[PDB]
């Protein structure tokens, strides 16, 4: 829970999380990394020196890609979401995407926030 976090090195992240960083953020420098706990659920957080932040679940699968200082790399985003954003907000870039096992939440440069379920039905749209 609150304040139970521990600092970690990159080589202590699950393999999948290390590969994700090398694939999508190869030139970023890690500023800090930690492991968090919530009951028996572990999560990992990485912040780069430019301020961009990643969170991963216990298996190193991303739950947050917060690129508010740049943009979310397009290869990270599910096609259905890319397509929806491209049609409906053609000039916006994505600053942040988060997900759990039930939904995705997307935040765009133009202030719009969109929630999709796992089948990509738009649940809520807010500004
Ligand atoms: C609090 As920050 C450096 O992840 O915007």
TrEMBL record:
Pfam family, one: PepSY_like
Stretches assigned to the Putative beta-lactamase-inhibitor-like PepSY-like domain: 6-32, 42-123
Gene3D superfamilies according to UniProt: 3.40.1420.30
Keyword DNA repair tagged: no
Record's keyword terms, sorted: Signal
Protein name: Putative periplasmic protein
